[PDB]
Amino acid sequence: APDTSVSNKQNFSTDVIYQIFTDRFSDGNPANNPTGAAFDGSCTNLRLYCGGDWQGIINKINDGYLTGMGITAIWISQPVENIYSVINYSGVNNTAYHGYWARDFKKTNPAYGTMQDFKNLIDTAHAHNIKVIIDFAPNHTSPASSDDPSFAENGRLYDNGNLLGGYTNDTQNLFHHYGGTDFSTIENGIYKNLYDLADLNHNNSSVDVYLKDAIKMWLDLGVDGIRVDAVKHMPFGWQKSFMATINNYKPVFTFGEWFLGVNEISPEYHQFANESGMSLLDFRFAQKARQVFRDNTDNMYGLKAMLEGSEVDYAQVNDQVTFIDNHDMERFHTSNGDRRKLEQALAFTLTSRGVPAIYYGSEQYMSGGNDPDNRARLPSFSTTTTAYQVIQKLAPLRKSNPAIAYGSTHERWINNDVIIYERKFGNNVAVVAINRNMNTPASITGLVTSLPRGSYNDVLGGILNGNTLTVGAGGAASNFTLAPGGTAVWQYTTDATTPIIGNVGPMMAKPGVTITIDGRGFGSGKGTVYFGTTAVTGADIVAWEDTQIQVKIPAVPGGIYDIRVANAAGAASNIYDNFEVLTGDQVTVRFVINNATTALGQNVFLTGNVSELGNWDPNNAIGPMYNQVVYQYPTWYYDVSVPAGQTIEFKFLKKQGSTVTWEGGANRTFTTPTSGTATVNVNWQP
């Protein structure tokens, strides 16, 4: 099927996502509304249920509100049954309207709809070429106090109606009991509770298996993507085995939320997007876009540097989900803010690299501060706002112009208030000019583009004061004045003759799994796919057409490979690197080592004989290990994803700067479980 098909669950760069808080969008079924203290039909107490549900989203797909705007994916609240309690937090009553306070991951939240209503949403969305992404929040259940078992539902977890356990008297240790996090360290935010939420214990085999069985159920119901909540607050090692479960079963686009503030760049955040098997909400993009287009705390050179630097820091930048606001930020549009600021930021996001997400009601110019004020009911379903028309015009270009879906980004002209960038993929081009100064026109002289000669009409039709671009010989444009607040988009598409890979999904899986390679110029006839120097041809290529190849991963050693395609004529593509072939199915094992004393700056790491443990290379060793919450120094511990059902060999080592101290003695061996978790508890061997 083509790369733009709704059946492409692996890659979303050709899509535009509309993020919906289900409760705040449309009440299509009043009979499923909560009653009593849990409900507020006027939606003026923003912490109660207002009534929005899955029938309301079905109605807005059917009547053309969502499809008229060019939306091709919706991202909805977690679908799972939540606690029914109205919790009073110092006078204010609070309900689970947001879907984050789960009690049974195998059932539906009835305020949103039945399981038949969820299937009707999936089938209605897919009949209209809309993909469905769901939130999934496996870090916790709901508010709980083990001291007071009567508070809320005591964090209880059920498995399809059957109670597994509560937070008080947790004799099976389904939950963590280390107190609440102060967010001082990543280790501290993982194993301690976020606020009062009962933290799930993923080292318990019952919890591990239950959450993996629950996500497969939702994949079986046909969801096309998953947004994982609180990825900074769960063990990396457990999240990599969770991703391997999804990818080796039914791979779908998965991304997580790791918040970053203004000007914060975190190595760990980049490491997680590059190695977990999931991508991330692009906070680095969002925060700089708000600084340049909203708050005016940086200028176009800051925008340029973010686009140039993130193309490099993210190993797969086309998989990062971009946005200008969402449920964890104040709405971009302010009361005294020019609406043109919101319209340009949306045009910038829709034509930029990655997977664009628009927070519901942006097209209706909703303003509001932080939670819960950024989650009001949307006030109007008017299809004639300028912002609705901007999305309507630009969102289709992700499906039709591969330079917007996959292309590189090149700044062609800039000054403090103007940027003109080009997106390029093969011979497909898009050029975008934006002037954020609302008072001053900009004289553009010397603009050179990759556009063929012609008179290109603004795709926005002049609604944000854009103009025609006349391109002469050698891509040189005739000089023009860019209007105050002007934004224009010019483009040119054609066929690729050379294979060019724009995106691959999933990026981590074991041998035998089918991966999806998207791009242009592959040809109709079946060619060759290279994983390193290994050629995959013939029947192992499940499908080949010009924009998409589906191929089985060859039985190669675990490790990281470059992918390259050669069409039937032997013309080869660009390399798409960093593909991780796993040794096999994964399980998370907790490694615990006692009596490992260290100097300042020296930490303990683990390596071993499989790719998942870095294949004996100290530079790729797992760590640094933790030593504060579950176990305390000089005992160190870490949860590591490791191949299931086999004997691995390993050693611990201490590293400080460039010095590696290996423990002495013979290599350690351990036979891993086939499912569930395991703990290895050993003593440092001098």
Ligand SMILES: [Ca+2]
């Ligand atoms: Ca309802």
Ligand SMILES: [Ca+2]
């Ligand atoms: Ca946690």
